[PDB]
Design a protein around this ligand. Structure first.
Ligand code: HEM
Ligand SMILES: CC1(C)[C@H]2CC(=O)[C@]1(C)C[C@H]2O
Ligand SMILES: [K+]
Length: 405
């Protein structure tokens, strides 16, 4: 349902890609997006869907634009424009140099030292969950594992009660892959209002949790305000609750459908870190963007001030110019090139936590439930958006084949 072509946009660059409902979604969501890398598709195209915006389709351009924050601003990073304008999460809605003071604070609460700290706890959350599912011979992996494992890890990190999980998870869904019940803005404001009273509790009586640290943080030589803390904690929550959740489901759908790749990791456990990186390339799932700060000529194309440009992080590693046979999963692939965690100054802060959650899941699942497949008669369906995902993943196994360590 398409917006009229802006005067400055050449009509031969039009390709009406809908990022929330792409044409070939039934073939798998990465497959659907990959059509933007067809021979007949330009390196930089314009879609009239979702209010109209640019799309960079190749890794070269995507990296280039994410590096140039002077022209491509993160102030309005979501499509549609109404979402992007409402978007005020910290650090992401800020450009350097102002972004950097807030990024250091956020890195304090989810960075590698924190993750090393939480290793034994992450390991047990996984094992407890899997040992509980193991004798049942079946699960809906998205809501039985993919959702609770990362989210309990985050609630742990944030010092938040697991009672609040249903409320919170719903809100984050609306911001990346909404049904239509709430706009981005009201979903975001709901999350903010959840966090305000907790932030104000913890400014006064400090702490070791992510919220306490953020609420007591110092930025620009001053205390962080309750409103800044809120904009940052909201982002950490969205980060903590929606991407890994979705990625685990892509990777497990794949392993469920490929006994060979399972047995490779079963037989060669040391390969699991390398396998994790190649899964991150193949089932890359993020796509947001930037907004033009001024009129600018970019690879032969005149971009105007206020134009929005989708720079799909997902597409870089599926680009056949960056990786040979991109849709093929090769755990021994020699140079794994992707931008799954982003590129430029907003490079994912949670990527060390994310890899840990992924690698612990692969290790602990295949150690206990080595053999499993898609439930008979089931057809897996994907969804698309800022963060694409899997709607459901019913898995089955013979409990007799399962192990206890
Ligand atoms: C598979 C897992 C994940 C993927 C693929 C992913 C992807 C990304 C991407 C592509 C960006 C850059 C977005 C942009 O440039 O606009 C980003 C940023 C960010 N991510 Fe992640 N993410 C993951 C997990 C996490 C986790 C677990 C957290 C934990 C809180 C997290 C927190 C953040 C934060 C705070 C930023 C903003 C950094 C900044 O703006 O400076 N992410 N993520
Ligand atoms: C695009 C993101 C994945 C990234 C910045 C966002 O707003 C996210 C949706 C959460 C954060 O990690
Ligand atoms: K904004």
């Amino acid at each position: 349902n398409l917006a009229p072509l802006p005067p400055h946009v050449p009509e031969h660059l039009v390709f009406d890609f809908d990022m929330y409902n792409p044409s070939n979604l039934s073939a798998g969501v990465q497959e659907a997006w990959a059509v933007l890398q067809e021979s007949n598709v330009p390196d930089l195209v314009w879609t009239r869907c979702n209010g109209g915006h640019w799309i960079a389709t190749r890794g070269q351009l995507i990296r280039e634009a994410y590096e140039d924050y002077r022209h491509f601003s993160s102030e309005c990073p979501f499509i549609p424009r109404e979402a992007g304008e409402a978007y005020d999460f910290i650090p992401t809605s800020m450009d350097p140099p102002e972004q950097r003071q807030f990024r250091a604070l956020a890195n304090q609460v989810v960075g590698m030292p924190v993750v090393d700290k939480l290793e034994n706890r992450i390991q047990e959350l996984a094992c407890s969950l899997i040992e509980s599912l193991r004798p049942q011979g079946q699960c809906n992996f998205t809501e039985d594992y993919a959702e609770p494992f990362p989210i309990r890890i985050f609630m742990l990190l944030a010092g938040l009660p697991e009672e609040d999980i249903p409320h919170l998870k719903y809100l984050t869904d609306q911001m990346t892959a909404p049904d239509g019940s709430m706009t981005f803005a009201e979903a975001k404001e709901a999350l903010y209002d959840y966090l305000i009273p907790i932030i104000e509790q913890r400014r006064q009586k400090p702490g070791t949790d992510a919220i306490s640290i953020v609420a007591n943080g110092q930025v620009n030589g001053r205390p962080i305000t309750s409103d800044e803390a809120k904009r940052m904690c909201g982002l950490l929550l969205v980060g903590g609750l929606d991407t890994v959740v979705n990625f685990l489901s892509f990777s497990m759908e794949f392993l469920a459908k490929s006994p060979e790749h399972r047995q490779e990791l079963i037989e060669r456990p040391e390969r699991i870190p390398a396998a994790c990186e190649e899964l991150l390339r193949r089932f890359s799932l993020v796509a947001d963007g930037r907004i033009l700060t001024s009129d600018y000529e970019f690879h032969g194309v005149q971009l105007k001030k206020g134009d929005q440009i989708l720079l799909p992080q997902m597409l870089s590693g599926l680009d056949e110019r960056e990786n040979a046979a991109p849709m093929h999963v090769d755990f021994s692939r020699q140079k794994v090139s992707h931008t799954t965690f982003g590129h430029g100054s907003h490079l994912c802060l949670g990527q060390h936590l994310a890899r840990r959650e992924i690698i612990v899941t692969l290790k602990e699942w295949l150690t206990r439930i080595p053999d499993f497949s898609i439930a008979p008669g089931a057809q897996i369906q994907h969804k698309s958006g800022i963060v694409s995902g899997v709607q459901a993943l019913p898995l089955v196994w013979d409990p007799a084949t399962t192990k206890a360590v």
